[PDB]
Amino acid sequence: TGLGALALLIAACRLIARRLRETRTTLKGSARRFNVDLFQVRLIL
Amino acid sequence: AACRLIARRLRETRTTLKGSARRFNVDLFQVRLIL
Amino acid sequence: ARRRAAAAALDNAMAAGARLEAEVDEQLRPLERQV
Amino acid sequence: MDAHIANETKQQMTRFAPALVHVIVPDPLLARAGVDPLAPFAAHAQTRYHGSGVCEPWVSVFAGHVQTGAVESVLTLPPLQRPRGPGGLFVSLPLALGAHFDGFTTAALRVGARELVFTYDELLPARTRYNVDGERLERLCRQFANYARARRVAPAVAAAGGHIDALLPPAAATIDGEAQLTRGGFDDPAAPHARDADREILSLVRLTALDWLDAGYAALAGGDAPAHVWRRRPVSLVARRHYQTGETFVVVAYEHSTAWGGRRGPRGEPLARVLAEECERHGVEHPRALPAEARRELVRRHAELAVPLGDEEPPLPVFDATAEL
């Protein structure tokens, strides 16, 4: 019984956990690109 | 039962961070318009 | 010249940044599906 | 659009510059630049590095000035619809890049009398917009279907029309170029992986479609017309602004093209990255006021950022979009 519904749910808890890390990675990239271009502006002027 | 209330807590935090970022963007549009 | 180029570049950067909150909100739709 | 193809071939065969870029300068830009359309053209261009004052000799480029709507001439096929809107001359500028494309180094254009400048930092956008062209192409094929069904011209095209009918809905169609610059959002190279990674987890918690258009449409006009072929492959036009006068202009990129953008086109990191990182690291507000012992490492890395940082006084003011002025 117990060994018939486990591997899937732990696989989930691991895979979505790592996909979350990748989400944070890409979000930081978006934010830092926007800030880099704002930095470009703050020296053009 | 934690992982249900806190699962929704995640969406709530994301939603309020959204409004934070949107007001950041408005205050950016400000300095865009002033000059 | 500087004042015009700065406005142009600011408008350009904002044109890309106009998707920030939308991306942040879209990214976490799995975590509703993942409970 | 023949101008872009001609320039790509002339560049690849001869290598008069490292890479290229496709641009559609519209009507009001030219108008405010002091130059007039509808007159004889003779296009040239040169690339002028910043802070030094070394200009590569001029190079003649093929330019072709449309009259009616320009943006739609990239999106639609002749026999099915007519374009609409403003129109400006197509042109392609040379570049100087390859490892870290330097910023603030312009690309000077020359038309009959007046010269326009286009700072790199303005010309080359990070992300492209290829995801909306699927939405455009499906409408285009449905358009061809409703044409072949109603005009009753030839049987070979009628079969293709029937196939397209049986493939996707026949509802209705129209192509609008202006709507392309508004509605869209910038495409990033991750989101398919987001959908894919979500696939496994949701599943756990518990001829072709378009070459019909090709084979058919090659019968209405009766000519392959290689210039057309790129109009069926997805394009991406990114509306940008201008630093010299403050108006709009577009930087298109075709999929098969070897220009800047698309596929099989070179990509170089925006040099402003290491500049911003080292500006923040040592803690100053400006790149020119950086401590020389720090600038030594920058000059050590990239042989391009040298002269804007080593000499006491550079020949031309550095880090300002208004050098030539």
TrEMBL record, chain A:
This is VP1/2. It comes from the Viruses. The chain crosses the membrane at residues 1-17.
TrEMBL record, chain B:
Signal peptide: none annotated. This is VP1/2. It comes from Suid herpesvirus 1 (strain Kaplan). The lineage of its organism: Viruses, Duplodnaviria, Heunggongvirae, Peploviricota, Herviviricetes.
TrEMBL record, chain C:
Coiled coil: none annotated. This is UL25.
From TrEMBL, chain D:
GO terms for cellular component: viral capsid. GO terms for biological process: chromosome organization. This is UL17 protein. Keywords: Capsid protein, Host nucleus, Late protein, Viral genome packaging, Viral release from host cell, Virion. It comes from Suid herpesvirus 1.
